[PDB]
Design a protein around this ligand. Structure first.
Ligand SMILES: [Cl-]
Ligand SMILES: [Mg+2]
Lengths: 250, 111, 244, 231, 229, 243, 240, 235, 241
């Protein structure tokens, strides 16, 4: 046995292309649409819960994931690749930051760590790149609210608003017309629901849509009282009912 | 605390003549004030007209002789059955002994 | 077994060229142009972001210009993710030197170290090389203001003015024409922006498509200051030099 | 064809071509004969020279006082395998005060060769061996193939033109098995056996190599004028 | 490096004209506490060897398992496992002696003293000793611990040298062994009345006697002893 | 195409062609069988006499594992020996930790997982043997057969090698005609017959019969080779049935 | 670890990776070495395709391995740094253990050994570099000049050249260098070295580098003007 | 591609057979064994007149009683020589004696087949190992990259080998003197060399019991060349 | 075309080796079904013993992973037992490290992660199996979680796997469309097994004897398999109404 694939499986072609990265991006293109919009007092990330079977309980499959109390993530592309990246991202937030500085990492630096992991799967021996693009939304004291995209190459870019996957080209055009620097969080959620409806074929309700926000601190979700400086997580996943309430004012 | 060494007594004597040599030793093996054996051979024919005795702690003594006998066997394999001269055997035994410089064979060797 | 699938990234061609290095250089030729110009009283770094969007958050964005320490900065051309791996290693190297000798690392020593890391990936390990070219802008008290470049082969050279990325042939000819030895920073700022404006593949050169930085002894007295220009500050210098 | 690039690949008919190619190296090698009675076991080997200025390549290797072999194929591979046998014979004597059984020596050689036929990176051994020995169950003769197959026999031959000697031994089976307590006659039978494999050349004084082991006979090799008696 | 916890005392043995005899009591001591009263310390290997062990019982049980594994391993791919290629006393001893010396050389000994008793293929008697230091020796009589001090002197009166072995019958040898076990019961504070005895004969094979008791004891003279002066 | 050039590669069918090619080596080997009886198991194998120079009864093929398990195989003999060596290590470690001798189903999985592991990577070749094995444990008699893929099941009777079809048909008759069961001594006789009958696929050269058995009543649950009078009796019974 | 045998024999008995490494040397800028009676001169070509270069800080082509030995090269620049570093470490290690600086031959033998090792080690490719190693042995006034190549073979030379168009300058040296009477002075040796490069270089401006090494650790690099005076005098004699 | 340790259908290792082709391209080396000593001679073959020929080192001392000549990819020989020197010195340390010439040769040949995917390829050089010991007297061995070594009364390796070996077939007899062997090596080297043989492009050496291994001076060889010319003109 | 031999991306962003591993899943030609009751989780699977020489008691594709967790496998038996051994080891290690029984969904995720690694690392091949884990979880109640060669997993109200999975799936879908609840509203597990067998008979259109089926049942604190005689009693009750 032993892993005898100690050589790169991603290499430059004569034209300067890294084939495996391009092909990973193609897999992302086939993936279900997900988006993110940044407001003045928050960030929203959303996607469709494309259920593989009606017998499947789609609530048990989480496409939008908490990374830290103030940082969340959504994806487009290969689900299993996303799941393991979420596990690695959660852990690296502790091992390379919280266990050193006693606080959770700022959004940009956690994104940087996830990006590094994805870069290494593009150069290290005997592995293929991750077949996902991530959208990471978060808040921290000194940088405020932010939204980042991370691609299979490991490259990351900050966005005011964006979309990835199936209908990203049309969705990004829709977002360019609606976005301004004076949006409140509720306005951004409204625009997110409008944008997402265009790329969804079948049912469009709280049970088929997954949506989360980075907003105000939630002391009700902290689980304990007594420490004034601890005010609760800014990440909150909207319920099925909360989504449907905003679909009547749509 | 565990003591890895012991003393099995014994006395040996080697004398070189003009065209001969003798290696003698008593056959008594002991610990403290008890006799283990009245006849326990201590001087050995190791082949190639060489005799050897490693006196002191018998466990180390048996191990060294056993390793040297083995060295004679492998000298033949490796060097076309060449006879191991007494001077070459002596130098070889030095290396067997110094190989355990920091955990010695507790013996006094004579060939 | 596994040999079947090995591309053999570290072999010579019959002509004595390194395939992967040559192909990595081809990749870099499509990256946004970066320019460095060295003057008597400072250094300029100017670089073009690749076809951006209006929804990109520019003021928090960084893809071209990176700080290695207080005295040394780099301009990037190629894969950004690859560059960040090397940049972090260079930052650590600078701090290792500072801890060991209690002096800031001389520019060339940092450049040689990163270039040696690139070289290794071309000779052993069977891994693909880093698809990155750097322009190093820095200052130390031995040689003063210095410009270097390095590429995926791990070769590095010193320059008075240099470009990497797209349209380097056109850019280098324009720099060679207008550069003079007694030039000052304010003149070099103008030359860099004028050169990008002529070589760019975009229709027009605007603030949202640029990253800009200067290293000046225009720091109060006997010290050096790094200035990573803000979006509004790039907009102002574009008006000052008469490009917009 | 497409399945002979390495030892880790079966062909569509379930063959291992690298092993078969290693077997081919033995067929190119010089002939060597093995045979035994109930008291003794004998090896006879035709040595091969490079030219008239050169020496004749040695074919027989001693493994212990009671065991040894003859080779045909890649000589360095025989050195590796014989070294391993020397060590195993030696381990048995040092640890258990026990002479290694010839049958057990065959099992150990089989297993060592097998590992080189199922793993990537390695290669099969390119040599065939005839092992003779005298242990607690009498005289023994073994034939080793680098496929891993080890076989106990009354007599055999390997190398180029070995089929002639093998047929002769198959005829003489009932005669040479009964040659007990007569070393010279058993060697004669072996020299006559290997003669059935000669063409153009004949057995000379620096050409012939003989080994014998038995009841009160340590493994000894005869070369030079010591085999003129049998020419 | 360790210390022995649960221990077994003397093992005694001797050669006679046609074979060897070996014996050891059935006690497992825990310091001065006579904790375990049914411990078999004579372990037969095949029908030609008996290994007698004293010292640490946990290490004895380990050696017992090594020997059991040795028999299993010898039978592997061995058509003559119950014949010409069966385990000999000399093979079993050299194996144990190798293990014991290796363990002392790693400074992690098996805290035992062992006597291997048996008859070889050619009928020759085998009797040899090995201990936690890897020290080995052979003699017409062998004994461990207290037996070395009290049994050997009695057994050496029967077989004082090699030439006395052919003159010694199995009845005389067993008698001497049984008497020595009584003497050890009188004088060893870590001994028991119950013991096992094994005879390995070149003609009659292996006879293993369990649940033997020390008998014909003299105590009556104690009634007349009064005070300390 | 090219899917069959490397081990562990799935073809578009979902097949591992290298494992299927290993089966071809098994089918090329000599016939070996196993019969499950009332209180044990019997193993038998065909040994081709390539030449008169082969010493009779010396080149033993059936192998013991621990003291209660027998193993026989058809195909590449060295591969079978390698598998038995591993099996002996597995059985030793089981007994070391758990004291009791390894149960037959437990032992079956140990071999199964090891053989299956050689279908996971391209750096190794699959085993070129099918192995019939079994014995007696605390729950009674067990007979297993293990393929190059790592696949194994329990059997009433088993056969592999060049004459497996013939052997299987004979085994199926015994199952039908004896629902109550077969005795150990009967199974030895029947095993001899079946190998003799299966030798028609290898009729060019003559052969040597080799039988072994583990039985609760006949061998005290230990693996033993059938020798001497009992072997001759089985040979005579077999020769009588073919004529 | 990556163990792949990249340097292997071909049916005709060639190791192509080693031969292709020589093709990289052929592409490199020309280097030349000439030893006089009491000196050695190393000349190097600088390709003028790169102007706007900062010549103060750009890696120079001749490198001091110790105070008494220098090394120049033709081929891959990045590869040469690895050999130069190893040579410098070994030079100090030799001083530390033997209490004497390396001989020029010893240093050459070491560098050549490293190059050979990279031709039969798994997972590595050969160095695309040939070197010229020059200097004086400690307490010795006899000039030394050696050459190494990717295969690892090395030898001593009265005068030698490597790199692009080295066939031409070797032609010049073979007819102009007399063994019975080598360049008796520094002037004569530098003149012959500049002359040899002028057969190939183009403009005699910033394209020629000259380094003079004399006995007892006396090493100096000539400036542009000093070299320019040689360039001037050579062509004025040529106009005749 | 294909394994480095792969067998051909004929039962030969591809890489070993290919390394033998590289040795055929090497410069000629010749050895002749006599009862008075063993002579070793080589063709230097300088690629240019500016190359100082006395720096070409194709004859090398392993110990006082063992010398060695090489042909092929001579850079590959350096680690083989290093191992040989270490083995010779180590045995003297362990046994207070000289090592047998055969044992030294066997030790060198053990390195040969240590290649795979250890070194990445076989050695591309052949060695003529000459020496003396008390047991077997003056000896000459031919060590190949296959791991095989043959003892020879006389042997030639390199580009002019088969023409030289045919010449050695006719000229060698068991009564040759050391002087006769010296002239014989010079004669055959002169026959197979491209350039005209002189003291600068050819090198002689010998091993005797008394004086040990010695590389000949250019002045000493020049006299033997002049002696050769005169005796060939003598008939 | 070596992108089809190892787990790297094809130009369409596909992993062919993963897709072919899905095809190996149906090599046994066996169909399985899982449903949830009020207090239990039932899994049934077809049993085919094509050889008379086989011991039918050893032919099984249902595994007792832990006391609480059961697993049915769709795919070849070597890969099935590979996954079974690993799942057993993971479940035991979990209990040792974290002091409580490994939940069914957590084990599924863990095995799904391991499968994901085989789709990304070249030296390891995917296992040609689909794993359906069942239990009555102490927090979530009756649970069905299923893993595949892509490293995908999800919870189910009910599920089916095999060559004729679609027929069984649609049959189950139609029943839950009527009842409008996420489970079989039945007190006893016996009747939930009867429901499972009945609906497999309806979907496949085949009758079953006691030897044609294999049944696993998960209740609070234990998972167990039914004997042939227990299945016979189930079949008799189905026929009598
Ligand atoms: Cl995990
Ligand atoms: Mg994979």
């Amino acid at each position: 046995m032993t892993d005898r694939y100690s050589f790169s499986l991603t290499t430059f072609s004569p034209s300067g292309k890294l084939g495996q990265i391009d092909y990973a991006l193609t897999a992302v293109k086939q993936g279900v649409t997900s988006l993110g919009i940044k407001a003045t007092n928050g960030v929203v990330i959303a996607t469709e819960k494309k259920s593989s079977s009606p017998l499947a309980m789609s609530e048990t499959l989480s496409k939008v994931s908490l990374l830290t109390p103030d940082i969340g993530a959504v994806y487009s592309g290969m689900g299993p690749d996303y799941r393991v990246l979420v596990d690695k991202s959660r852990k690296v937030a502790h091992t390379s930051y919280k266990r050193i500085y006693g606080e959770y990492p700022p959004t940009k630096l956690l994104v940087s760590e996830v990006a590094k992991i994805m870069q290494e799967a593009t150069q290290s021996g005997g592995v293929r790149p991750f077949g996902v693009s991530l959208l990471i939304a978060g808040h921290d004291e000194f940088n405020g609210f932010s939204l980042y995209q991370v691609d299979p190459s490991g490259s990351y870019f900050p966005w005011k608003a964006t979309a990835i996957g199936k209908g990203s080209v049309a969705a990004k055009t829709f977002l360019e017309k609606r976005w301004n620097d004076e949006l409140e969080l509720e306005d951004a959620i409204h625009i997110a629901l409008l944008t997402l409806k265009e790329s969804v074929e079948g049912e469009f309700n709280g049970d088929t849509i997954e949506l989360a926000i980075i907003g105000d601190e939630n002391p009700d979700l902290l689980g304990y009282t007594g420490i004034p400086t601890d005010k609760g997580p800014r990440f909150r996943k909207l319920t099925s009912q909360e989504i449907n309430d905003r679909l009547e004012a749509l | 605390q565990f003591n890895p060494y012991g003393d099995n007594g014994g006395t040996i004597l080697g004398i070189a003549g003009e065209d001969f040599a003798v290696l003698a030793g008593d056959t008594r093996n002991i610990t403290d004030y008890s006799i283990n054996s009245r006849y326990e051979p201590k001087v050995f024919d190791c082949g190639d007209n060489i005799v050897m005795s490693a006196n002191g702690f018998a466990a180390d003594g048996d191990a060294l002789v056993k390793r040297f006998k083995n060295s004679v066997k492998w000298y033949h394999f490796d060097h076309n059955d060449k006879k191991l001269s007494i001077n070459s055997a002596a130098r070889n035994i030095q290396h067997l002994l110094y190989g355990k410089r920091f955990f010695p064979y507790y013996v006094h060797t004579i060939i | 077994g596994s040999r079947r699938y090995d591309s053999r990234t570290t072999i010579f061609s019959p002509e004595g060229r390194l395939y992967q290095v040559e192909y990595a250089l081809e990749s870099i030729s499509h990256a946004g142009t970066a320019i460095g110009i060295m003057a008597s009283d400072g250094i300029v770094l100017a670089a073009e972001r690749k076809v951006t969007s209006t929804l990109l958050e520019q003021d928090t964005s960084t893809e071209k210009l990176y700080k290695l320490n207080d005295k040394i900065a780099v301009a990037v051309a190629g894969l950004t993710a690859d560059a960040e791996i090397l940049i972090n290693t260079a930052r650590i190297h600078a701090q290792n030197y500072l801890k060991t000798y209690n002096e800031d690392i001389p520019v060339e020593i940092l450049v040689r170290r990163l270039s040696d890391i690139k070289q290794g990936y071309t000779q052993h390990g069977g891994l693909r090389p880093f698809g990155v070219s750097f322009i190093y802008a820095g200052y130390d008290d031995r040689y003063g203001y210095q410009l270097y470049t390095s590429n995926p082969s791990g070769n590095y050279t010193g320059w008075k003015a240099i470009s990497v990325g797209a349209n380097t042939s056109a850019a280098q000819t324009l720099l060679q024409m207008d550069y003079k030895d007694d030039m000052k920073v304010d003149d070099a700022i103008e030359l860099a922006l004028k050169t990008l404006s002529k070589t760019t593949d975009s229709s027009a050169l605007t603030y949202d498509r640029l990253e800009f930085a200067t290293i000046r002894k225009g720091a109060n007295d006997g010290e050096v200051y790094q200035k990573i220009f803000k979006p509004q500050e790039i907009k102002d210098i574009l008006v000052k030099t008469g490009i917009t | 064809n497409n399945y002979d690039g390495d030892t880790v690949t079966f062909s569509p008919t379930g063959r291992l071509f690298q092993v078969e190619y290693a077997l081919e190296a033995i067929k190119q090698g010089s002939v060597t004969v093995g045979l035994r009675s109930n008291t003794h076991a004998v090896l006879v080997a035709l040595k091969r020279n490079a030219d008239e200025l050169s020496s004749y390549q040695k074919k027989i290797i001693k493994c212990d006082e009671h065991m040894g072999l003859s080779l045909a194929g890649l000589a360095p591979d025989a050195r590796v395998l014989s070294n391993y046998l020397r060590q195993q014979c030696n381990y048995s004597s040092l640890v258990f005060n026990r002479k290694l059984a010839v049958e057990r020596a065959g099992h150990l050689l089989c297993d060592k060769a097998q590992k080189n036929t199922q793993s990537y990176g390695g290669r099969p051994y390119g040599v065939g061996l005839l092992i003779i020995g005298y242990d607690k169950s009498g005289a023994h003769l073994l034939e080793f193939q680098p496929s891993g197959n080890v076989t106990e026999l009354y007599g055999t031959a390997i190398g180029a033109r070995s089929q002639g000697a093998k047929t002769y031994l198959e005829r003489t089976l009932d005669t040479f098995i009964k040659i007990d307590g007569n070393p010279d006659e058993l060697i004669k039978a072996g020299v006559e056996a290997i003669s059935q494999s000669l063409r153009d050349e004949s057995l000379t004084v620096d050409n012939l190599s003989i080994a014998i082991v038995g009841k009160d006979t340590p493994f000894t090799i005869y070369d030079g004028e010591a085999v003129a008696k049998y020419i | 490096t360790q210390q022995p916890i649960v221990t077994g005392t003397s093992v005694i043995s001797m050669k006679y004209d046609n074979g060897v005899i070996i014996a050891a009591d059935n006690l497992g001591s825990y310091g001065s506490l006579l904790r375990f009263n049914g411990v078999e310390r004579l372990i037969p290997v095949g029908d030609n060897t008996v290994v007698g062990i004293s010292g640490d019982i946990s290490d004895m049980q380990h050696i017992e398992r090594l020997l059991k594994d040795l028999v299993t391993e010898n039978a592997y791919d061995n058509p003559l496992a119950d014949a010409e290629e069966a385990l000999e006393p000399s093979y079993i001893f050299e194996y144990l002696a190798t293990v014991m010396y290796q363990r002392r050389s790693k400074m992690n000994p098996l805290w035992n003293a062992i006597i291997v008793a048996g008859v070889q293929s050619n009928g020759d008697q085998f009797l040899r000793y090995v201990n936690l230091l890897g020290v080995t020796y052979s003699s017409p009589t062998l004994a461990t611990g207290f037996g070395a001090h009290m049994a050997n002197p009695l057994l050496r009166k029967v077989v004082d040298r090699e030439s006395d072995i052919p003159k010694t019958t199995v009845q005389v040898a067993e008698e001497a062994i049984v008497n020595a076990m009584r003497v050890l019961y009188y004088r060893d504070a870590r001994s028991s009345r119950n013991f096992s005895l094994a005879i390995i004969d070149k003609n009659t094979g292996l006879t293993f006697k369990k649940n033997l008791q020390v008998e014909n004891m003299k105590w009556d003279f104690a009634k007349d002893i009064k005070g300390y002066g | 195409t090219g899917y069959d050039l490397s081990n562990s590669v799935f073809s578009p069918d979902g097949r591992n062609f290298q494992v299927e090619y290993a089966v071809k080596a098994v089918e090329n080997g000599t016939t070996s069988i196993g019969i499950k009886c009332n209180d044990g198991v019997v193993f038998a194998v065909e040994k081709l006499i390539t030449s008169k120079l082969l010493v009779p009864q010396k080149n033993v093929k059936i192998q013991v594992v621990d003291r209660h398990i027998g193993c026989v195989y058809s195909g590449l003999i060295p591969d079978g020996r390698h598998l038995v060596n591993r099996g002996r290590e597995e059985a030793a470690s089981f007994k070391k930790l758990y004291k009791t001798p390894i149960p037959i189903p437990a032992f079956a999985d140990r071999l199964g997982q090891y053989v299956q592991a050689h279908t996971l990577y391209n750096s190794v070749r699959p085993f070129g043997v099918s192995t019939i094995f079994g014995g007696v444990d605390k729950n009674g008699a067990h007979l297993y057969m293990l393929e190059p893929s790592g696949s194994y099941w329990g059997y009433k009777g088993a056969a592999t090698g060049k004459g497996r079809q013939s052997a299987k048909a004979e085994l199926e008759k015994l199952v039908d005609h004896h629902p109550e069961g077969l005795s150990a001594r009967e199974a030895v006789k029947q095993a001899a017959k079946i190998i003799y009958l299966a030798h028609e696929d290898n009729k060019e050269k003559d052969f040597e019969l080799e039988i072994s058995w583990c039985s609760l009543s006949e061998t005290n649950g230990l693996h033993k080779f059938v020798k001497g009078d009992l072997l001759q009796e089985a040979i005579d019974f077999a020769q009588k049935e073919i004529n | 670890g990556y163990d792949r045998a990249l340097s292997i024999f071909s049916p005709d008995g060639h190791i192509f990776q080693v031969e292709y490494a020589l093709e990289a040397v052929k592409r490199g800028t020309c280097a030349v070495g000439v030893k006089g009676k009491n000196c050695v001169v190393l000349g190097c070509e600088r390709r003028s395709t790169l102007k706007l270069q900062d010549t103060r800080i750009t890696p120079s082509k001749v490198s001091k391995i110790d105070s008494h030995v220098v090394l120049s090269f033709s081929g891959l620049n990045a590869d040469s740094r690895i050999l130069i570093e190893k040579a410098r470490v070994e030079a100090q290690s030799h001083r530390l253990t033997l209490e004497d600086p390396v001989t020029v031959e010893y240093l050459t033998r070491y560098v050549a050994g490293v190059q050979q090792r990279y031709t039969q080690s798994g997972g590595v490719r050969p160095f695309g570099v040939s070197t010229l190693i020059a200097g004086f042995d400690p307490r010795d006034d006899e000039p030394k000049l050696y050459q190494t190549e990717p295969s690892g073979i090395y030898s001593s030379w009265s005068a030698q050249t490597i790199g692009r168009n080295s066939k031409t300058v070797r032609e010049f040296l073979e007819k102009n260098y007399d063994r019975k009477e080598p360049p008796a002075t520094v002037e004569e040796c530098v003149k012959l070295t500049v002359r040899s490069l002028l057969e190939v270089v183009q403009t005699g401006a910033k394209n020629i580098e000259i380094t003079v090494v004399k006995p007892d650790s006396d090493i100096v690099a000539l400036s542009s003007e000093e070299i320019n005076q040689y360039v001037t005098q050579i062509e004025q004699e040529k106009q005749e | 591609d294909r394994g480095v340790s792969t067998f051909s259908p004929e039962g030969r290792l591809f890489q070993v057979e290919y390394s033998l082709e590289a040795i055929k391209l090497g410069s000629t080396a010749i050895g002749i064994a006599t009862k008075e000593g063993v002579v070793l001679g080589v063709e230097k073959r300088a690629t240019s007149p500016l190359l100082e020929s006395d720096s070409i080192e194709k004859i090398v001392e392993i110990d006082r009683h063992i010398g060695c000549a090489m042909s092929g990819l001579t850079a590959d020989a350096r680690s083989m020589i290093e191992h040989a020197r270490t083995a010779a010195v180590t045995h003297n340390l362990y046994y207070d004696e000289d090592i047998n010439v055969e044992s030294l040769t066997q030790s060198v040949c053990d390195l040969a087949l240590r290649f795979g995917e250890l070194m990445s390829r076989p050695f591309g050089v052949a060695l003529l190992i000459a020496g003396h010991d008390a047991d077997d007297g003056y000896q000459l061995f031919h060590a190949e990259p296959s791991g095989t070594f043959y003892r020879y009364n006389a042997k030639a390796i390199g580009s002019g080998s088969e023409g030289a070996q045919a010449e050695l077939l006719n000229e060698w007899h068991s009564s040759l003197t050391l002087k006769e062997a010296e002239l014989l090596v010079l004669k055959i080297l002169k026959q197979v060399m491209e350039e005209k043989l002189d003291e600068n492009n050819a090198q002689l050496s010998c091993i005797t019991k008394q004086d040990g291994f010695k590389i000949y001076d250019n002045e000493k060889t020049a006299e033997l060349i002049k002696e050769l010319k005169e005796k060939e003109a003598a008939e | 075309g070596y992108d089809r031999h190892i787990t790297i991306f094809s130009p369409e962003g596909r992993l062919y080796q993963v897709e072919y591993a899905f095809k190996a899943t149906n090599q046994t030609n066996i169909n399985s079904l899982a449903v949830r009751g009020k207090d239990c989780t039932v899994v049934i699977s077809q049993k085919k013993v094509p050889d008379k020489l086989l011991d039918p008691t050893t032919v099984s594709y249902i595994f007792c992973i832990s006391r609480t967790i059961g697993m049915v496998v769709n795919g070849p038996i070597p890969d099935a037992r590979n996954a079974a051994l690993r799942a057993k080891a993971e479940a035991a290690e979990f209990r040792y490290k974290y002091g409580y029984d490994m939940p069914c969904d957590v084990l599924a995720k863990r095995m799904a992660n391991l499968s994901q690694i085989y789709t990304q690392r070249a030296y390891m091949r995917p296992l040609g199996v689909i794993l359906t884990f069942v239990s009555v979880d102490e927090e979530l109640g009756p649970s069905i979680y299923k893993t595949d060669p892509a490293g995908y997993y999800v919870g189910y109200k009910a599920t089916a796997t095999g060559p004729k999975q679609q027929e069984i799936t649609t049959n189950l879908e139609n029943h839950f469309k009527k009842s409008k609840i996420d489970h079989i509203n039945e007190e006893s597990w016996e009747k939930v097994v009867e429901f499972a067998i009945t609906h497999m008979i309806d979907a496949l259109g085949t009758e079953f004897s006691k030897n044609d089926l294999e049944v696993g049942v998960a209740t609070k604190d234990k998972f167990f398999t039914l004997s042939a005689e227990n299945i016979e009693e189930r079949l008799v009750a189905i026929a009598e109404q």
